[PDB]
Write a protein that binds this ligand. Structure first.
Ligand code: CLA
Ligand code: CLA
Ligand code: CLA
Ligand code: CLA
Ligand code: CLA
Ligand code: CLA
Ligand code: CLA
Ligand code: CLA
Ligand SMILES: CCCCCCCCCCCCCCCC(=O)OC[C@H](COP(=O)(O)OC[C@@H](O)CO)OC(=O)CCCCCCCCCCCCCCC
Ligand SMILES: CC1=C(C/C=C(\C)CCC[C@H](C)CCC[C@H](C)CCCC(C)C)C(=O)c2ccccc2C1=O
Ligand code: SF4
Lengths: 183, 151, 63, 741, 83, 38
């Protein structure tokens, strides 16, 4: 039966959001049931999603990499990477103090100018034109869209995955790899 | 409406009511075969469960039904709420339609579809009546099973 | 035993009161002759009257 | 009939108008040529019915501005919870409520201000708080900083949601005028939905969280050892141990066997001997009974289903032979004027704040509130001031209604019209009553000062000479003392120990005891009657003569707020309704100052203090009220002079901020007199000479300096007078009571 | 205004009969309000010079009677005058 | 550009400049406390 006009591909019973037309790389579904895009800037939301994607992806890989092996001079007492115990240690070491400085530097001198450009409509959200190896191709190609769609799908998975990582480690008090091996 | 002596359709819109009836029916239909299933067969994970509508509920309230509530509530918040609000406001969606038909069991044309649509509701209503009866019977038989009810 | 009896009477009286009390009754209902909105209104009044009477007689050691 | 109808995307979200100061006004949008413009921008910013003639556009601004107010309240509440969580001795205070001083403000070490970090106990140094937050949080069952943190975060999320909703209902989905005019619907929802379900859901918290947590705290269980609130909900056996009725569950509710909940829902009256607070089983039952009342009350008004009352029909029905057309028109008045509604709503909310002040000291609702004298004094005083300001506001908006919104067509031979038609009779009689009350109330003090000064103590109005016993108040105290088991058969104890019966102590400190009324109490009550009648005279005169008098027959044309109609007709300074509000503020300040002084002294003299092992009551000021409070000299000497000792000796102590604020507040008060006693003509001429000097050095501004408007001079004057006067008392009170209490 | 002083005749008998219902027990007796109030004046006019104290329940029987009588007679005026 | 015009309005620039000024004076008294002379 379906609704009268254009229906949301991801949820065929709900009407398609006005702004989400299915054209965006990782937005074929036009998935916005709660209707955030109806009230909020899409360029803002897209910048946030892609930012969260990239932070989450590094963080999920970071946990796995740090679990397998940590550096010697960083005397890591906790084997739980998403514990308060470990976080607190590398705040006191000044390791997280250092990366906070350059993250804050990036966000103020790059991220905030980049966001403002996107709100004015002079930048695609997430674009810093960073492709040294050219594993995307020309900016706006079918290859670029496949990688852009790939970035979000990998990022969205990492975002959720990091939820699983943190919460499971908080109950079990075991490593993510340690949990997989032992039940 | 054909049978509406109280004239509830005069106060709440039929689209909303027919969403509720079909929603209730689908819950009642899974609940009826669910009660026969759990009273017949038990999973290896639980083993020592009551297998009684009241007892099984009270047993699985903190764990299994809490998880069911969480993911059932999730669906209602994301799909159920915008669906129900869009129907009454006038989206043109049939009440009950969540576009769930992996197979081709609905039918073709209109006659066969509306028969299958009527079939769902009347199967829903009978399962709805059934589930009320099973609680009354289990309550006033000293916690007797649905199959154990037949002497 | 006395609780259901008083409650049915209080609901039936509120229903009878309702036919005269409510401005423009329905008279398009088989037996009661009130619409659903008015039935809920009268039964609501019958509940308040019923609960209050029951608690009145319970406090006086009559039921 | 009752329907949701909104306009969509009605106002674009742009910073354009932020960069255009005074965009909202046709007069201001052109920008400044003089400094008067800068003041006008601020004075007019929220006068929405001056910006536009559209009632719809006014209504939509109001609704959205209201969300702004709730957002700010949520930031403030969140702040209070976060300061509790992060910078307080609350957790330590739970383990020693009588010994530890509540503190939730820590100052930074800079320029020696860390002296203000007082030795409050509970392993912190900070400012002692008097807001009663700890007593509130203890009553709510909060035992740890996580619960306070999560409430603070919750508060910020509610602040965010209020901001979104304010933005949303102005810019995206603005309701139409006909939405706002659904007064019947609004009242059903606010009665049943806001107050009814608020009280029902709060009663829920009390029965499930407050009751079990406080029962275990009162038994002396360590707050860390108390089960978390959800354990009382999950494990019913835990709850059944504390309140056995929880064995029977909800079966006794649906079956009307309500006596089974006698453990959780009580009518004990009086106070906990442990905490000196109201029994939480009384409070839970109160909130259940109120909830039902409000849910039932909110079924009164007709909406979409025929049943219910037309408020129009109700008003028009209440017509008698002495009052013409009666309440005809008032439905139209109250559905077409925001100011009319704000007038009523401020009168009642203000009057409510005052009732709250009286009820909260006398029936101390929170555990360890009664014997936290700083909190008791602070809460009474605070809620008195908020009440006073609101009542004067009611006068302002009643008068704004009369100037801007009143029509003779709507109000034709109705109670409002008929009041205007005998304003001379009303104001002449109230004037008379003010002179009668003033002479026979204040005159008794002056008589007494004179007789005492002349060595004629036997000629005084006093308990030991010419007695003025408040026999009616004394008689009512007796009736309320005799109530339990008699006219309140199921009440175990008095509503309040203020009326009679026992002295409640927590440790050695008096929570509450009978407040005996004598000649001093009779006299000060007639001062209160006096100061309230005069305030009413000023504000009511403002309303009834807002539109015209024999002096100014066209006053409505000059508006609500205007300085005068010139020096002619003998001089017409301060004829405007606004100027009546201005004068009303001073009298409200006068009236309420005497109320909070009456409170402070009476409580210190006759209520608050210590009870020894022998069981002899020693009050803070040792019963000096009865013989000292019957002369002005006694108020000057035994109250102001004697009790100011703490604030003026505060330098070099943790209370030194009160000493500084005491002087600072005196300064601001005195500074106010410059504005109140002078006129802008002097100031504009002075500025001319100063402007000359700037012109000489080629540094005169293009925005020409102006003296404040005549009205702004008055506004600045009364604002500094009130700020200075109130802040002086604040510093006096807090220094006094934190020291001796 | 029709007046009709017979409003006062109904106001007395109407309130007095309604107030003469038997109550529970305390600071009243169980007889009623009127039976207590008419008993209170009997033992007070017996000592005609020396009036009542604040402790005496006569003052309560006075107020609750009169605040009930004034209520019943004021609502008596509106009824007869405005049918 | 309109937001920057707003941030250039008298009360915003006064607030920010006096905040900065207060910060400098506060921080000077934090690091050089009790300076009664040069
Ligand atoms: C974490 C931040 C984040 C943000 C800012 C976005 C933002 C966006 N998403 Mg993405 N998305 C995310 C995470 C996020 N997403 C994750 C983890 C997944 C995997 C499920 C997706 C899967 C997804 C799909 C398939 C699509 C989008 C699309 C979009 C765009 C339009 C919809 C929208 O406005 O969402 C706004 C989202 C937020 C403001 C974040 C959610 C905030 C809520 C309040 C969090 C808590 C809710 C609740 C408690 C969750 C649990 C409930 C229950 C299920 C247990 C917008 C740019 C659409 C698009 O056009 O892509 C280009 C689209 O088709 N998203
Ligand atoms: C990006 C930077 C990075 C750095 C600096 C390291 C550093 C290290 N890795 Mg790791 N590793 C990384 C990324 C990194 N890894 C990634 C992306 C993976 C795939 C998930 C791994 C998977 C991995 C495994 C399986 C092991 C290490 C081990 C080690 C340690 C080897 C010590 C040694 O033998 O000399 C060293 C501390 C070894 C170790 O734990 O030392 C005993 C080891 O067995 N690494
Ligand atoms: C509870 C306090 C409160 C609330 C809820 C409001 C609400 C409002 N003010 Mg008012 N205002 C206030 C206090 C308040 N004000 C005070 C104390 C003054 C000084 C006298 C003013 C002076 C003032 C002026 C001069 C103007 C307003 C205006 C407004 C309106 C639009 C604001 C807007 O869109 O920004 C949205 C706000 C945010 C996104 C958050 C604020 C972020 C800042 C930087 C902090 C809105 C009704 C404007 C208006 O258009 O009214 C007709 C206007 O020109 N106000
Ligand atoms: C988030 C971005 C945003 C933007 C860009 C706009 C933009 C606009 N708003 Mg909207 N609005 C918003 C959010 C926003 N609004 C929110 C969150 C609300 C709910 C409060 C509203 C409710 C609203 C109303 C009711 C009105 C507008 C109006 C307007 C227009 C004029 C605003 C102006 O001059 O304000 C500049 C004003 C300020 C920056 C002052 C804001 C004061 C805030 C709210 C409170 C301050 C806190 C506290 C009192 C501070 C005390 C500090 C101490 C020193 C004393 C402009 C198109 C007005 C209009 O006329 O449109 C046609 C109008 O009447 N808005
Ligand atoms: C149950 C229905 C309901 C409730 C709870 C309210 C509550 C409120 N309305 Mg009213 N309103 C209603 C129906 C309701 N309204 C209807 C039908 C109309 C049209 C006839 C109006 C028209 C109206 C106007 C024109 C105005 C209000 C305003 C208000 C606020 C008054 C100030 C106050 O007391 O803050 C108390 C604050 C709180 C209790 C905290 C915030 C509560 C939020 C809004 C949610 C509450 C309801 C929600 C269902 C709670 C969920 C519970 C959760 C456990 C699931 C208050 C929040 C005034 C206002 O301030 O608007 C912003 C205002 O100007 N209302
Ligand atoms: C101590 C300061 C002071 C005093 C004594 C007064 C006195 C009065 N004010 Mg004023 N008022 C004051 C400060 C004061 N005000 C200030 C600072 C403001 C600016 C905000 C005002 C603004 C103001 C307004 C707007 C109004 C008043 C009104 C009143 C009158 C109230 C009625 C009344 O009680 O009259 C009786 C007189 C007194 C209580 C004063 C002393 C009485 C003595 C003790 C008894 C009589 C003595 C005897 C006759 C003397 C004979 C001696 C002689 C032979 C030598 C009263 C005359 C109101 C009014 O006029 O009401 C009708 C009124 O509307 N005042
Ligand atoms: C507004 C002007 C202002 C200026 C010029 C400074 C300047 C400085 N700050 Mg301060 N700071 C300020 C405001 C300012 N701060 C405010 C408002 C806060 C409260 C949020 C702080 C909180 C703060 C902290 C926590 C620290 C500084 C530190 C410093 C010093 C870093 C070198 C430098 C002297 C750092 C320092 O060197 O002190 C140890 C440091 O740790 N500042
Ligand atoms: C009106 C005149 C006045 C004067 C002359 C002073 C003078 C002083 N005050 Mg006082 N004070 C005043 C009013 C005044 N105050 C008021 C109204 C208050 C209440 C708010 C205070 C409260 C106060 C406190 C609580 C303290 C002071 C302190 C000081 C000393 C500060 C030295 C300093 O900041 O480091 C040196 C600063 C500079 C050299 C400024 C340099 C500016 C730039 C960066 C230079 C750029 C290079 C060209 C100085 C002796 C402090 C003190 O140490 O007393 C002995 C101190 O603790 N004041
Ligand atoms: C409260 C008692 C009011 C008694 C007024 C009498 C009263 O209630 O009568 C009220 C009387 C009722 O008239 P109607 O029968 O026409 O009223 C029908 C209503 O539906 C319309 O309002 O109206 C008047 O006569 C106007 C009032 C003038 C009264 C003038 C004196 C006012 C000053 C009162 C001083 C005592 C105050 C003591 C307060 C503690
Ligand atoms: C003192 C006085 C004045 C003079 C006061 C004036 C003109 C107000 C003074 C303005 C103050 C000082 C603010 C101006 C400051 C500028 C905005 C510059 C700020 C600079 C930095 C702090 C940002 C009147 O104009 C007046 C009018 C009517 C009755 C009584 C009086 C009255 O008593
Ligand atoms: S003194 Fe001032 S207020 Fe009075 S008439 Fe003259 S201008 Fe008007």
């Amino acid at each position: 039966q379906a609704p009268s006009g254009a229906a949301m591909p991801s949820m065929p019973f709900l009407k398609r959001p006005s702004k989400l037309d299915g054209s965006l790389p990782g937005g074929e579904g036009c998935f916005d049931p709660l209707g955030f895009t109806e009230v909020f800037s899409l360029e803002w939301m897209r910048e946030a999603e892609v930012k969260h994607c990239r932070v989450a992806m590094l963080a999920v890989l970071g946990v796995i990499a740090q679990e397998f092996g940590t550096l010697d001079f960083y005397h890591a007492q906790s084997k739980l990477q998403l514990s308060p115990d470990l976080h607190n240690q590398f705040v006191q070491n000044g390791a997280l103090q250092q990366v906070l400085l350059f993250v804050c530097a990036w966000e103020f001198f790059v991220g905030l100018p980049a966001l403002i450009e996107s709100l004015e409509g002079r930048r695609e959200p997430g674009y810093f034109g960073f492709d040294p190896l050219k594993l995307g191709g020309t900016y706006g190609s079918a290859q670029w869209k496949r990688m852009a769609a790939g970035e979000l799908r990998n990022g969205r998975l990492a975002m959720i995955a990091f939820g699983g990582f943190f919460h499971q480690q908080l109950l079990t008090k075991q490593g993510i790899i340690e949990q997989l091996t032992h039940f | 409406a054909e049978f509406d002596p109280l004239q509830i359709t005069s106060y709440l819109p039929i689209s909303w009511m027919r969403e509720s009836e079909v929603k209730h029916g689908r819950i009642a239909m899974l609940a009826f075969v669910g009660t026969l299933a759990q009273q017949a067969y038990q999973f290896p994970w639980y083993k020592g469960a009551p297998t009684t509508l009241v007892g099984a509920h009270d047993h699985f309230v903190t764990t299994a039904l809490a998880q069911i509530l969480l993911f059932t509530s999730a669906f209602e918040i994301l799909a159920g709420v915008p669906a129900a609000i869009q129907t009454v406001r006038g989206s043109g969606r049939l009440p009950g339609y969540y576009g769930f038909d992996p197979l081709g069991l609905w039918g073709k044309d209109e006659a066969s579809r509306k028969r299958m649509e009527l079939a769902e509701v009347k199967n829903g209503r009978l399962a709805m009546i059934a589930m009320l009866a099973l609680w009354h019977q289990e309550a006033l038989s000293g916690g007797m099973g649905v199959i154990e009810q037949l002497v | 035993s006395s609780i259901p009896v008083i409650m049915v009477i209080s609901n039936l009286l509120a229903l009878a009161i309702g036919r005269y009390a409510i401005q423009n009754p329905s008279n398009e209902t088989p037996i009661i002759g009130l619409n659903l909105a008015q039935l809920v209104a009268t039964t609501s009044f019958g509940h308040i009257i019923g609960v209050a009477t029951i608690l009145g007689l319970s406090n006086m050691g009559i039921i | 009939k009752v329907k949701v109808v909104v306009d969509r995307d009605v106002v674009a979200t742009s910073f354009e108008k932020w960069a255009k100061p005074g965009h909202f006004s046709r007069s201001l949008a052109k920008g400044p040529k003089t400094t008067t413009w800068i003041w006008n921008l601020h004075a007019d910013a929220h006068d929405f019915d001056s910006h536009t003639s559209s009632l719809e556009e006014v209504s939509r601004k109001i609704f959205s501005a209201h969300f702004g107010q709730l957002a700010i309240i949520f930031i403030w509440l969140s702040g209070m919870y976060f300061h509790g969580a992060r910078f307080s001795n609350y957790v330590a205070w739970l383990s020693n409520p009588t010994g530890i001083k509540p503190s939730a403000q820590v100052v930074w070490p800079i320029v020696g201000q860390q002296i203000l970090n007082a030795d409050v106990g509970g392993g912190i140094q900070g400012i002692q708080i008097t807001s009663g937050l700890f007593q509130l949080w203890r009553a709510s069952g909060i035992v740890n900083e996580l619960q306070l943190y999560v409430t603070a975060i919750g508060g910020l999320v509610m602040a965010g949601l209020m901001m979104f909703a304010g933005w949303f209902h102005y810019h995206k989905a603005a309701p139409k005028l006909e939405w706002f005019q659904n007064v019947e619907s609004m009242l059903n929802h606010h009665l049943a939905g806001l107050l009814g379900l608020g009280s029902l859901s709060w009663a829920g918290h009390q029965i499930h969280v407050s009751l079990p947590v406080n029962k275990l705290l009162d038994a002396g269980v360590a707050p860390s050892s108390i089960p978390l609130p959800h354990e009382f909900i999950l494990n019913r056996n835990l709850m059944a141990e504390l309140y056995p009725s929880f064995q029977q569950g909800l079966a006794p509710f649906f079956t009307l066997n309500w006596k089974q909940y006698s453990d959780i829902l009580t009518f004990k009256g009086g106070l906990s001997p442990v905490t000196g607070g109201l029994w939480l089983t009384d409070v839970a039952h109160h909130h259940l009974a109120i909830a039902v009342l409000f849910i039932v009350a909110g079924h009164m008004y007709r909406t979409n289903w025929g049943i219910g009352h037309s408020m129009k029909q109700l008003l028009e029905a209440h017509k008698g032979p002495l009052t013409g057309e009666g309440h005809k028109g008032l439905y139209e008045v109250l559905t077409t004027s925001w100011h009319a509604n704000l007038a009523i709503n401020l009168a009642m909310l203000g009057s409510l704040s005052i009732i709250v002040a009286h009820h909260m000291y006398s029936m101390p609702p929170y555990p360890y509130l009664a014997t936290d004298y700083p909190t008791q004094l602070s809460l009474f005083t605070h809620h008195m001031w908020i009440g006073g300001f609101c009542i004067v506001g009611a006068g302002a908006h009643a008068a704004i209604y009369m100037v801007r919104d009143y029509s003779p067509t709507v109000n034709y031979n109705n109670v409002l019209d008929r009041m205007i038609r005998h304003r001379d009779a009303i104001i002449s009689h109230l004037n008379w009553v003010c002179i009668f009350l003033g002479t026979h109330s204040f005159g008794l003090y002056i008589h007494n000062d004179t007789m005492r000064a002349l060595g004629r103590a036997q000629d005084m109005f006093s308990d030991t000479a010419i007695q003025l016993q408040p026999v009616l108040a004394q008689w009512i105290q007796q009736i309320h003392t005799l109530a339990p088991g008699n006219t309140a058969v199921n009440a175990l104890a008095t509503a309040s120990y203020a009326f009679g019966a026992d002295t409640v102590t927590v440790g050695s400190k008096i929570a509450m005891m009978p407040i005996k009324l004598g000649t001093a109490d009779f006299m000060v009550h007639h001062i209160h009657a006096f100061t309230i009648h005069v305030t009413v005279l000023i504000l009511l005169k403002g309303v009834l003569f807002a539109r015209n008098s024999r002096l100014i027959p066209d006053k409505a044309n000059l508006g609500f707020r205007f300085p005068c109609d010139g020096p002619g007709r003998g001089g017409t300074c301060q004829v405007s309704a606004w100027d009546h509000v201005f004068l009303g503020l001073f009298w409200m300040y006068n009236a309420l100052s005497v109320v909070i002084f009456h409170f402070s002294w009476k409580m210190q003299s006759d209520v608050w203090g210590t009870v020894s092992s022998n069981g002899t009551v020693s009050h803070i000021t040792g019963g000096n009220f009865a013989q000292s409070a019957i002369t002005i000299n006694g108020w000057l000497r035994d109250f102001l002079w004697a009790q100011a000792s703490q604030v003026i000796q505060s330098y070099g102590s943790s209370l030194s901020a009160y000493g500084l604020m005491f002087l600072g507040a005196h300064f601001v008060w005195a500074f106010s007199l410059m504005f109140l006693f002078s006129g802008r003509g002097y100031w504009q001429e002075l500025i001319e000479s100063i402007v000359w000097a700037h012109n000489k050095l080629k540094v005169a501004p293009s925005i020409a300096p102006r003296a404040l408007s005549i009205t702004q001079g008055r506004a600045v004057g009364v604002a500094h007078y009130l700020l200075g006067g109130i802040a002086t008392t604040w510093a006096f009170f807090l220094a006094r009571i934190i020291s001796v209490g | 205004y029709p007046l009709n002083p017979a409003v006062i005749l109904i106001a007395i008998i109407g309130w007095s009969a309604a107030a003469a219902v038997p109550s529970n027990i305390p600071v009243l007796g169980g007889t009623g309000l009127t039976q207590a109030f008419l008993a209170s004046i009997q033992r007070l006019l017996a000592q005609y010079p020396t009036g009542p104290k604040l402790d005496d329940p006569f003052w309560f029987y006075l107020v609750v009677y009169h605040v009930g009588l004034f209520a019943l007679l004021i609502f008596g005026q509106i009824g007869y005058a405005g049918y | 550009m309109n937001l920057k015009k707003y941030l250039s309005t008298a009360p915003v620039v006064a607030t920010l400049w006096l905040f900065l000024t207060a910060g400098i004076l506060i921080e000077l008294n934090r690091f050089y406390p009790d300076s009664l002379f040069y």
